[PDB]
Amino acid sequence: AAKDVKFGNDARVKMLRGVNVLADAVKVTLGPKGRNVVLDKSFGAPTITKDGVSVAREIELEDKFENMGAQMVKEVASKANDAAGDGTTTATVLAQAIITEGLKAVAAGMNPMDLKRGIDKAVTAAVEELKALSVPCSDSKAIAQVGTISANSDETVGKLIAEAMDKVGKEGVITVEDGTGLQDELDVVEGMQFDRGYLSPYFINKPETGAVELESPFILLADKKISNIREMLPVLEAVAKAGKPLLIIAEDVEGEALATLVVNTMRGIVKVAAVKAPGFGDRRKAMLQDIATLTGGTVISEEIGMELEKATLEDLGQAKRVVINKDTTTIIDGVGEEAAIQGRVAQIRQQIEEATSDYDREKLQERVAKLAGGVAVIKVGAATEVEMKEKKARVEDALHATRAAVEEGVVAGGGVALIRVASKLADLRGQNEDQNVGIKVALRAMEAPLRQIVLNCGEEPSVVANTVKGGDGNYGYNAATEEYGNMIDMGILDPTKVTRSALQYAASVAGLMITTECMVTDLP
Amino acid sequence: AAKDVKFGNDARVKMLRGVNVLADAVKVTLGPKGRNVVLDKSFGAPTITKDGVSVAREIELEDKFENMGAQMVKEVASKANDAAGDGTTTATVLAQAIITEGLKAVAAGMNPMDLKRGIDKAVTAAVEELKALSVPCSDSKAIAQVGTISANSDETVGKLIAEAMDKVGKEGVITVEDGTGLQDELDVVEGMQFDRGYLSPYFINKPETGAVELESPFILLADKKISNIREMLPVLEAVAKAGKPLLIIAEDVEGEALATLVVNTMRGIVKVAAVKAPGFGDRRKAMLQDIATLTGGTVISEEIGMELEKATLEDLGQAKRVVINKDTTTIIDGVGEEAAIQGRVAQIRQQIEEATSDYDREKLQERVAKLAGGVAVIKVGAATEVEMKEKKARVEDALHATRAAVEEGVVAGGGVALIRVASKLADLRGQNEDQNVGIKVALRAMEAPLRQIVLNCGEEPSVVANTVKGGDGNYGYNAATEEYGNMIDMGILDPTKVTRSALQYAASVAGLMITTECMVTDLP
Amino acid sequence: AAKDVKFGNDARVKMLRGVNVLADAVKVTLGPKGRNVVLDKSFGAPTITKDGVSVAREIELEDKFENMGAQMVKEVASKANDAAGDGTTTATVLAQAIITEGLKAVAAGMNPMDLKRGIDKAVTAAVEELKALSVPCSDSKAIAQVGTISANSDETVGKLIAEAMDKVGKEGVITVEDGTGLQDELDVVEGMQFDRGYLSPYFINKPETGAVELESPFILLADKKISNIREMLPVLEAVAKAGKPLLIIAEDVEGEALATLVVNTMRGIVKVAAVKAPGFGDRRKAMLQDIATLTGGTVISEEIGMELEKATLEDLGQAKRVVINKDTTTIIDGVGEEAAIQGRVAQIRQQIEEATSDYDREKLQERVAKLAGGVAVIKVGAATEVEMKEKKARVEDALHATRAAVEEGVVAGGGVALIRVASKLADLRGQNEDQNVGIKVALRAMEAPLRQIVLNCGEEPSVVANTVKGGDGNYGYNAATEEYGNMIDMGILDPTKVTRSALQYAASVAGLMITTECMVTDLP
């Protein structure tokens, strides 16, 4: 396993074939006419996929050359999944084309670093070009079109996403889960909801199937397990003379207090619903106070000078209707001031980002969307778990793409905007001839992905691409119909965020990787 | 784990040959003339079995290509076995036909996605046709006939299962168990049953053979053990006043209490029997109130401040008869509310939709059978464990077939319905001629299971297929009669669900496999 | 692991090779001229054997093919040993011949199902005919004859066994084990007895070996720890005033109890025999209850609602005489009525007829014999350890054969019943030609064991069989002396149960030969 070193093109040629390897591993799956690849599973059955990165993630070759090349190209695709997950094939093909043009330039003895300088300043110019070319994406028709593009002519899933997103609002949170039957299940859970079950089964309410409902109850917060005191009776009798149902949130209730608390609810005196703590202590308590403010309750924590039994009856929060089952507790609409809710939203706006990013951001965004609106749940069903996941990954990709389109809009899809801005920026000049040829190299390498896209349909890339370059504006080529026309007719519009981020990150990684000159390796 | 990358036709033929070897190894079991397969077992004697997936689950190939193919294809067979368990050979054969046709089409340059669409539409049409042509099966004669064919022309088993299902009612539970004698014996156990014996052997009552029986007793349920709870002395006096026997359900009883009780019973003071709770804490908590509802009593709860010491006369469950042996207790005509029985049944109906599925179904249907259905025990009597395996396997095949037929309805067996629906659906056309070609080729090749069924009998598949294509209606060939006639005459009926699931799963999996264009392996 | 599949001719050839292995392994042991086999043992001495299962159960060969063939044929031999244990060589040979002929027929293209049904019908008809021709024999002369037939010209052992069985009665059993003296020793003592050594050696009276014999003692059996209590002063003083010797069976003895008891011994006031509890708690308790019933005492312990320090002197039983050895104890006669005998034997008998069988029933006959008869003890002694093992195996085979013959009855032994049933059942007919072919093949193969016997004897097998087929009744051939003659004169008779079980096992192995079509192995 001793280290061995080589220099320049002799090693680079090895890289090429490995690149070549990974390259044709990916580009076979591009386009509507592109096919799938099944990935061996060490534990169970192999899984079908169309995304190049899903294929490549586990891929490494026997020899050190190709193995390290695959790892060093796989990082950008990993980041692409970290952000969006699609367009990975484009990043791979552009990387291959640019590294080939890089070896061509090195054959001229040309400086890689000034090449990178010219190329990435041209990339920034293209960023500005794309920002200028951005158009708003507002109509749900375009949303359905882009989802259908992402979902392989699946009008059902895309349209379903459309009404779900519309009725939950643009800031409403939407989640996709498993289903077994041939039909997806659409659920909306609005207000406040948590997944905790009643400790006592005797809470079976008047509605059949054990369905539990409370109209305008009094919600209360506690931090103690009520065992030693065993006397909530002052509060109980205050609610009894109030004569209205109640919900309690506490550490726990001991069986001794539980007996009368359930026995007394039967008696019909006060209906009381007791639940376990939904989540981890500090943050869960923090969101319970937000719920209390939402429900018109007061900030109540037993870990401060105030007492459970020492309080004012108005401290109990009220919500119009609460629905409780064996596992799920939900509120339809509560009694709270929207000014205070929006103040809490402003308070939590900066916490939306924080610095933890991955763990904190999505959790907090879904939680706050629940705090303001509701969550959408879509049970995507299919015959086999591999089929479910194969559709699923496209579902989350389309979800993220819809988020990008909502936040930023779209640009002319099908790569025509790319080639037009490249043609317009062909006039760009650098410090010297090195930067100029670097810009031209970047242009000619960007030409290749579109040509491969055309080739994916079993049609000639050259003259078709030339015809694409001939027209402008709405004129573009559709692979599904394999014909030219408007973007609106073809619905091929590129979400701005995914294209911008993927293209620029791929450009950066390519510019830094073409700088290879020396090789270290291990022996068998 | 070094990886190797392969393209196109080579992997295609590898997958072809592996699937073909597995399939024609399976084919030796198809039809009445099919035989068994012997599988080497390291621990002891080999396993001899007919159903294909039973063989498949342990199949592992020396070659990585074929190993990947076998493991990727076994999922459909495994889940089909999980669904029904028989006809799996037919599903495998038709799947192989689909693979052959798909690879042949792709060899022509076929579009994989067009094939996917075509096979999907064909499956939709076939499912609708099966729904349309499905006919109900109600008469016990036809039930016995389908059991007989499902038991490999065993009429004795058919009459046995028909008698069992009749006496266990429509919602009874039927199970097959190991038998001691040289022949099968079927027993019917009805009423409230559980497997718990009397605490002491001296509990043997008046009935001989060491049996412990009480006529018109009362039933006590103790939430916890007996330490000082033997203070039911007042209730005892009432029982002493009533001159009635008693039954005890308690966690545990003191040795002094056990000794004092035994003496009381043998002295004739009060004659009482005691048995333990049937199952786990959750199970017993759920089913004790079910027992009470059957016997019209009130469960003594340690969770509520009602106990044995403070109790009512009718808190004892009321039943007409109790019969207890060394480890089993039976209750005859418990005196309880039938409407409460329906309420508990409806609660069970709501609880039907459960992720636990079969593990939940055991007790879920156990309670219903104890209330309304019945218990059937099929003790398989024979010498060799392989023979019990074979007869048992035929037993659950017949059981599943009968259950599915009763709940669902039937179609003609032997694939006559398959060829009929293929002929009727030959008229459907899709979006593209590519899709139409996929559909029509699927129709051409879907008769292959019938071809192999004929072949297993050592008879010309081509002659029979041509003659059947000439014939119409329920006319068809039977191997048991080894001649033609009416398919109904022999009473070979297929549940629609098994055929539908097999066809849809085979089409889905085949469509996903054929789209693969790249291969990856690891070397030894 | 890597699997390799064999089909049809090749798999059948491997089965034939396993058959050849089995045949050469077994043939060496058929008849008087079929000789013993030495069993290699790296641990200890290689062991000489003749029983077919004894030769078989430990034999496994390297080549996987015949290895799994042997593994799958081991089950029939194992089951036969667990059922009868003798005639295993004969049943194995007949089954092997049947299998060989069936494999030949399948090589001719035989139908598995025709074989299945024809062999089932033939087995059923042969069982019926064998039952019809069954002649029970009860004379001790015939019992000695058949025991010697099993013992291969051992007369004294057969006479001893017959006398022992007669003296132990119809329900009394016989125990056989190794001996030191080269002559077998038979010891039978009637009544109640179990082996138990006294904790205090000073229980030795004037007679030797600590044997004490006492008149009408006060027999007490206690399942409770008597060490803790000691005391018993009122009862001890009552017995002392009565003037009779003292008998106690205690769980344990205290140092104080030891002290007062040894003071009693060396002081010479009262002779007291104290013994520890016999064995395993619950079952020892049950058999102690049996002893108390047979002695006319009362079952008294803390498991009974009697009091320790308060008791009545008549509560204990009295015996005609009690004898105690160094490590065993017997009672010559006790207070036991035949009605209580019937009741206890019946409540034991119901447990005897159960599915537990092994590891529980033998103790059941032990206890029952202690209730009614006595234990028969056999000491077989000789020179070399391997030869004692062989003699023990042969003697136990004879023991089981005698038990089966006594409980069931016999037919003509030496295999002549086989030829006679084959002759009389030449008229059997099946459903079709193939069934009749299979039946006739089985009938022809029925001749194999006897012709193999004659071949081993060095005489013309087929002509001797033909000559036997000419006569009828009990006239046939003698292999020990090797000449014709009547069976009755030399009494070659065999219990019918082993014959029927062999036929049933043959039916099962035939039913598992018919499906031999595909086999799977694992090669490195």
Short mmCIF file of N, CA, C and O in Angstrom, two decimals, chain B residues 27-90:
data_model
loop_
_atom_site.label_atom_id
_atom_site.label_comp_id
_atom_site.label_asym_id
_atom_site.label_seq_id
_atom_site.Cartn_x
_atom_site.Cartn_y
_atom_site.Cartn_z
N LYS B 27 -40.27 -24.27 -12.21
CA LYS B 27 -41.34 -24.81 -13.05
C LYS B 27 -41.63 -26.28 -12.78
O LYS B 27 -42.73 -26.75 -13.10
N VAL B 28 -40.68 -27.02 -12.20
CA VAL B 28 -40.87 -28.44 -11.95
C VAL B 28 -42.01 -28.71 -10.97
O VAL B 28 -42.39 -29.87 -10.79
N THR B 29 -42.55 -27.67 -10.34
CA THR B 29 -43.62 -27.81 -9.36
C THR B 29 -44.98 -27.39 -9.90
O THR B 29 -45.99 -27.63 -9.23
N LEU B 30 -45.04 -26.79 -11.08
CA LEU B 30 -46.28 -26.22 -11.57
C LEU B 30 -47.28 -27.31 -11.96
O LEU B 30 -46.90 -28.35 -12.50
N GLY B 31 -48.55 -27.05 -11.68
CA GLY B 31 -49.62 -27.93 -12.09
C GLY B 31 -49.73 -29.15 -11.21
O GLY B 31 -48.91 -29.38 -10.31
N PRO B 32 -50.77 -29.95 -11.44
CA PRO B 32 -50.88 -31.22 -10.70
C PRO B 32 -49.72 -32.15 -10.95
O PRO B 32 -49.36 -32.92 -10.05
N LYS B 33 -49.11 -32.11 -12.13
CA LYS B 33 -47.96 -32.96 -12.42
C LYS B 33 -46.65 -32.37 -11.94
O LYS B 33 -45.60 -33.01 -12.11
N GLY B 34 -46.66 -31.18 -11.35
CA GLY B 34 -45.45 -30.65 -10.76
C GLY B 34 -45.00 -31.46 -9.57
O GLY B 34 -45.79 -32.07 -8.85
N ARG B 35 -43.68 -31.49 -9.36
CA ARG B 35 -43.08 -32.23 -8.26
C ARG B 35 -42.54 -31.26 -7.21
O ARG B 35 -42.77 -30.05 -7.27
N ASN B 36 -41.84 -31.80 -6.23
CA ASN B 36 -41.24 -31.01 -5.17
C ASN B 36 -39.77 -30.75 -5.45
O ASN B 36 -39.15 -31.39 -6.30
N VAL B 37 -39.22 -29.78 -4.73
CA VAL B 37 -37.82 -29.41 -4.82
C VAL B 37 -37.18 -29.64 -3.45
O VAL B 37 -37.78 -29.33 -2.41
N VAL B 38 -35.97 -30.18 -3.46
CA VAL B 38 -35.22 -30.49 -2.26
C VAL B 38 -34.14 -29.43 -2.08
O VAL B 38 -33.38 -29.14 -3.01
N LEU B 39 -34.06 -28.87 -0.88
CA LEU B 39 -33.14 -27.78 -0.56
C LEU B 39 -32.26 -28.22 0.59
O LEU B 39 -32.77 -28.55 1.67
N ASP B 40 -30.95 -28.21 0.38
CA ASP B 40 -30.02 -28.67 1.40
C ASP B 40 -30.09 -27.79 2.64
O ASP B 40 -30.11 -26.56 2.55
N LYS B 41 -30.12 -28.43 3.80
CA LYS B 41 -30.16 -27.75 5.09
C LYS B 41 -28.99 -28.22 5.94
O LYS B 41 -28.83 -29.42 6.17
N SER B 42 -28.17 -27.27 6.40
CA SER B 42 -26.96 -27.62 7.13
C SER B 42 -27.27 -28.27 8.47
O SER B 42 -26.60 -29.24 8.87
N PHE B 43 -28.27 -27.76 9.18
CA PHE B 43 -28.55 -28.24 10.53
C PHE B 43 -29.01 -29.70 10.52
O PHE B 43 -28.69 -30.46 11.44
N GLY B 44 -29.76 -30.10 9.50
CA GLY B 44 -30.32 -31.44 9.47
C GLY B 44 -30.77 -31.88 8.10
O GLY B 44 -30.08 -31.68 7.11
N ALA B 45 -31.94 -32.52 8.05
CA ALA B 45 -32.47 -33.01 6.79
C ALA B 45 -32.84 -31.85 5.87
O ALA B 45 -33.17 -30.75 6.34
N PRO B 46 -32.79 -32.06 4.56
CA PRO B 46 -33.17 -31.00 3.62
C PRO B 46 -34.67 -30.71 3.68
O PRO B 46 -35.47 -31.52 4.14
N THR B 47 -35.02 -29.53 3.19
CA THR B 47 -36.41 -29.08 3.14
C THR B 47 -36.98 -29.38 1.76
O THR B 47 -36.41 -28.97 0.75
N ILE B 48 -38.10 -30.08 1.73
CA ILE B 48 -38.75 -30.49 0.49
C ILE B 48 -40.04 -29.69 0.36
O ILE B 48 -40.93 -29.79 1.21
N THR B 49 -40.14 -28.89 -0.70
CA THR B 49 -41.26 -27.97 -0.84
C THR B 49 -41.64 -27.79 -2.30
O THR B 49 -40.82 -27.95 -3.20
N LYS B 50 -42.90 -27.42 -2.51
CA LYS B 50 -43.45 -27.18 -3.84
C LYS B 50 -43.52 -25.71 -4.21
O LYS B 50 -43.15 -25.34 -5.33
N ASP B 51 -43.99 -24.86 -3.31
CA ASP B 51 -44.24 -23.47 -3.66
C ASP B 51 -42.93 -22.75 -3.94
O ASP B 51 -41.95 -22.91 -3.19
N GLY B 52 -42.90 -21.97 -5.02
CA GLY B 52 -41.64 -21.50 -5.56
C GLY B 52 -40.88 -20.57 -4.64
O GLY B 52 -39.67 -20.72 -4.45
N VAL B 53 -41.57 -19.58 -4.06
CA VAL B 53 -40.88 -18.57 -3.27
C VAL B 53 -40.26 -19.18 -2.02
O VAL B 53 -39.23 -18.69 -1.52
N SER B 54 -40.85 -20.26 -1.51
CA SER B 54 -40.22 -20.98 -0.40
C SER B 54 -38.83 -21.43 -0.79
O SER B 54 -37.88 -21.31 0.00
N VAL B 55 -38.67 -21.95 -2.01
CA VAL B 55 -37.35 -22.27 -2.52
C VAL B 55 -36.54 -21.00 -2.73
O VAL B 55 -35.35 -20.94 -2.40
N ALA B 56 -37.17 -19.96 -3.27
CA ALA B 56 -36.45 -18.78 -3.72
C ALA B 56 -35.74 -18.10 -2.56
O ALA B 56 -34.57 -17.71 -2.68
N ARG B 57 -36.42 -17.98 -1.42
CA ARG B 57 -35.94 -17.14 -0.34
C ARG B 57 -34.51 -17.49 0.08
O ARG B 57 -33.78 -16.63 0.57
N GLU B 58 -34.11 -18.75 -0.10
CA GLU B 58 -32.76 -19.18 0.24
C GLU B 58 -31.85 -19.30 -0.98
O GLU B 58 -30.75 -19.84 -0.86
N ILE B 59 -32.28 -18.82 -2.14
CA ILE B 59 -31.48 -18.95 -3.35
C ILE B 59 -30.38 -17.90 -3.35
O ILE B 59 -30.65 -16.70 -3.19
N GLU B 60 -29.14 -18.34 -3.52
CA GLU B 60 -27.99 -17.45 -3.67
C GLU B 60 -27.06 -18.03 -4.72
O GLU B 60 -26.68 -19.20 -4.64
N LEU B 61 -26.69 -17.21 -5.70
CA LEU B 61 -25.92 -17.70 -6.83
C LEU B 61 -24.43 -17.44 -6.64
O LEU B 61 -24.02 -16.48 -5.99
N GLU B 62 -23.64 -18.34 -7.22
CA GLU B 62 -22.19 -18.17 -7.22
C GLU B 62 -21.80 -16.89 -7.96
O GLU B 62 -20.90 -16.16 -7.52
N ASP B 63 -22.46 -16.60 -9.07
CA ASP B 63 -22.12 -15.43 -9.85
C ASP B 63 -22.84 -14.21 -9.28
O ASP B 63 -24.03 -14.27 -8.94
N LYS B 64 -22.11 -13.10 -9.18
CA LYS B 64 -22.66 -11.88 -8.60
C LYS B 64 -23.80 -11.33 -9.45
O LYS B 64 -24.76 -10.79 -8.91
N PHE B 65 -23.68 -11.45 -10.77
CA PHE B 65 -24.74 -10.98 -11.66
C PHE B 65 -26.05 -11.69 -11.36
O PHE B 65 -27.08 -11.06 -11.10
N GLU B 66 -26.01 -13.02 -11.38
CA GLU B 66 -27.19 -13.82 -11.07
C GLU B 66 -27.62 -13.68 -9.62
O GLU B 66 -28.81 -13.76 -9.32
N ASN B 67 -26.67 -13.47 -8.70
CA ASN B 67 -27.05 -13.23 -7.32
C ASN B 67 -27.86 -11.95 -7.19
O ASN B 67 -28.91 -11.92 -6.53
N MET B 68 -27.40 -10.88 -7.84
CA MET B 68 -28.14 -9.63 -7.89
C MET B 68 -29.51 -9.81 -8.52
O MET B 68 -30.52 -9.31 -8.01
N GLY B 69 -29.57 -10.52 -9.65
CA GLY B 69 -30.85 -10.73 -10.30
C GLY B 69 -31.83 -11.48 -9.43
O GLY B 69 -32.98 -11.07 -9.28
N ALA B 70 -31.37 -12.57 -8.80
CA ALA B 70 -32.25 -13.35 -7.95
C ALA B 70 -32.74 -12.53 -6.76
O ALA B 70 -33.94 -12.54 -6.46
N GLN B 71 -31.84 -11.82 -6.08
CA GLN B 71 -32.29 -11.06 -4.92
C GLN B 71 -33.19 -9.90 -5.32
O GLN B 71 -34.10 -9.54 -4.56
N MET B 72 -32.98 -9.31 -6.49
CA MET B 72 -33.81 -8.18 -6.89
C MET B 72 -35.19 -8.68 -7.31
O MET B 72 -36.20 -8.00 -7.08
N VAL B 73 -35.26 -9.88 -7.89
CA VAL B 73 -36.56 -10.41 -8.30
C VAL B 73 -37.33 -11.08 -7.16
O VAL B 73 -38.56 -11.18 -7.25
N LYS B 74 -36.66 -11.54 -6.10
CA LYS B 74 -37.37 -12.31 -5.08
C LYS B 74 -38.36 -11.48 -4.27
O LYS B 74 -39.19 -12.07 -3.57
N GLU B 75 -38.27 -10.15 -4.31
CA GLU B 75 -39.18 -9.34 -3.51
C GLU B 75 -40.63 -9.57 -3.89
O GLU B 75 -41.50 -9.70 -3.03
N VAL B 76 -40.91 -9.61 -5.20
CA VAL B 76 -42.28 -9.79 -5.65
C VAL B 76 -42.82 -11.14 -5.21
O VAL B 76 -43.95 -11.23 -4.71
N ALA B 77 -42.02 -12.19 -5.35
CA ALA B 77 -42.46 -13.52 -4.93
C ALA B 77 -42.68 -13.57 -3.43
O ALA B 77 -43.65 -14.15 -2.95
N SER B 78 -41.78 -12.94 -2.66
CA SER B 78 -41.91 -12.95 -1.21
C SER B 78 -43.18 -12.25 -0.77
O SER B 78 -43.93 -12.77 0.07
N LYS B 79 -43.47 -11.08 -1.33
CA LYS B 79 -44.66 -10.36 -0.89
C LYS B 79 -45.93 -11.03 -1.40
O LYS B 79 -46.96 -10.99 -0.71
N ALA B 80 -45.89 -11.65 -2.58
CA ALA B 80 -47.03 -12.43 -3.04
C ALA B 80 -47.30 -13.60 -2.10
O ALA B 80 -48.46 -13.89 -1.78
N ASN B 81 -46.25 -14.28 -1.65
CA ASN B 81 -46.41 -15.32 -0.65
C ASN B 81 -47.02 -14.76 0.62
O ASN B 81 -47.90 -15.38 1.22
N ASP B 82 -46.55 -13.59 1.04
CA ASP B 82 -47.14 -12.93 2.19
C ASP B 82 -48.62 -12.64 1.97
O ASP B 82 -49.40 -12.64 2.93
N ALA B 83 -49.02 -12.43 0.72
CA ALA B 83 -50.42 -12.14 0.43
C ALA B 83 -51.25 -13.41 0.42
O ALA B 83 -52.15 -13.58 1.25
N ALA B 84 -50.96 -14.33 -0.51
CA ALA B 84 -51.75 -15.53 -0.68
C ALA B 84 -50.97 -16.80 -0.37
O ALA B 84 -51.34 -17.56 0.53
N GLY B 85 -49.88 -17.06 -1.09
CA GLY B 85 -49.04 -18.22 -0.88
C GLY B 85 -49.12 -19.30 -1.95
O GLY B 85 -48.23 -20.15 -2.00
N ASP B 86 -50.15 -19.29 -2.80
CA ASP B 86 -50.24 -20.27 -3.86
C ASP B 86 -50.52 -19.57 -5.18
O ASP B 86 -50.95 -18.41 -5.21
N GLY B 87 -50.26 -20.27 -6.27
CA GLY B 87 -50.21 -19.64 -7.57
C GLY B 87 -48.96 -18.83 -7.78
O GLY B 87 -48.84 -18.15 -8.80
N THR B 88 -48.03 -18.88 -6.83
CA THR B 88 -46.78 -18.12 -6.94
C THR B 88 -45.98 -18.59 -8.14
O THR B 88 -45.31 -17.78 -8.80
N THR B 89 -46.02 -19.89 -8.44
CA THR B 89 -45.35 -20.40 -9.62
C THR B 89 -45.90 -19.75 -10.88
O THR B 89 -45.14 -19.39 -11.79
N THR B 90 -47.22 -19.60 -10.96
CA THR B 90 -47.84 -18.96 -12.11
C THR B 90 -47.38 -17.51 -12.24
O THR B 90 -47.08 -17.04 -13.35
#
